[PDB]
Amino acid sequence: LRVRSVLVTGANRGIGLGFVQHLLALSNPPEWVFATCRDPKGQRAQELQKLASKHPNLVIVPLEVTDPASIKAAAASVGERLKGSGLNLLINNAGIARANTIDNETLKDMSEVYTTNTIAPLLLSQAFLPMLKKAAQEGLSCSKAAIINISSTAGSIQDLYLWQYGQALSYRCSKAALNMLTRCQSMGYREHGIFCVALHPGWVKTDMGGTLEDKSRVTVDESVGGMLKVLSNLSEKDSGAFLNWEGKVMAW
Template identity: 60%
Template sequence: MGELHIHSVLVSGANRGIGLGLVQHFLGMPTPPKWVFAGCRDPKGQRTHELQNLASKHPNLVIIPLKVFNPASIKAAAATVEKHLGSSGLTLLINNAGIVRNTELEEGTLENMIQVYTTNTTGPLLMGQAFLPLLKKAVQGSPGSALSCSKAAIVNMSSIAGSIAYPLEWDRMQIVSYCCSKVPPASVNMLTKCHSVGYKEHGILCITLYPGWVQTDLGSASKQKPPVTVDASMQRMPKVLSSLSKKDTSTFLDWERKVVPW
């Protein structure tokens, strides 16, 4: 298993939960990235205090406004990142932002479905498009042809709720808008497959990653306490990222590097 050597990384939904945990991990690496971009909807909002505190201690952390459901916001974020990177590219794009609405089958509405689908599925699609030029720059600046997260990669964070074949989640969490926005082949996992096929020629690794059922606001939406802490997930997930190679692109793996059935 190799080590991550990342020049730059962008994490969406970075002000809390898994996104914040990822930012903390990257900043705490023995050799941290030169640039860590933390995207969140309201950088000056009440729920960004911890992220702001990190930024005050780490000059390589840049907090940027990013609403993944808004194409104009995504383009503006890409332009901001490009200004900081200069002639270098973006090594790692982690599409982590996601929302959930507690609606069961009988309560699902058009508004809920559109809102959740736009954030959880369309958002990663538009993010990939907007940051593709910077990912391609990273490839050009990285020697060798092997795919890896240290060269250039898109990581789409998903949920085991997106697995039709995994029965436990159906008994535990029947949240129709969230499950549909995460269920293959219509959503995030199929998008990763499309990413892997479309961006393979550019040398970009693309993968879907399940961080575990983590104790976050989103993870607790089913009214049950998730078994995995953010710290426990962060101890495992970076190791998974460091181990990824060409054979893993387009796959759906969990925080313990196990293949998740679609």
């Protein structure tokens, strides 16, 4: 696993911050790690800010993933830093979940969860397509040109992971639709030499994973150490797949 440039959304806390830390700590670290976040001037951005003060490597980019203009500015801004060099790796990680029961689910929540979890990875892939294409041109591997969508087995229609812990229909629907988007990107972008894959990170001890004790749970470090290992072993025939942080096949 050797990537010269990577962009991670939702990079200030939880799994996305884990990705940043691990990526900077790779045997051969990237030339550019772009870590996006909503409020680079907020307390929740500080851990990232300090990381950037120690690593000239790390570029904090402001990004509201549901706002097409914010997405546009973030893409101009990273494109100017890459000075026409490619983007090897896009990790769509930013996401939300809302704790609504099937009976309480609303149009608002169904819609907002979908636009953050599903539409935004599409928009961001479209906006960075030019840079991913460049990188492919400089089979299909994550070291070359890849889109990584962080999904969930909560969005597995077969498995319905963790049903007895939460219904979160807006979230499950959005994650199934993200597994479909991943398949579509895989087929649509294959001709550009761009790999796509969906990953389940596990039930991670983050703000989203919640407070519950369970020994199937994993730490941020175990989850992202896993996912990065998985990426480093992926080849063409896995493009469009849905794999977990241990590299296992998850049912759709």
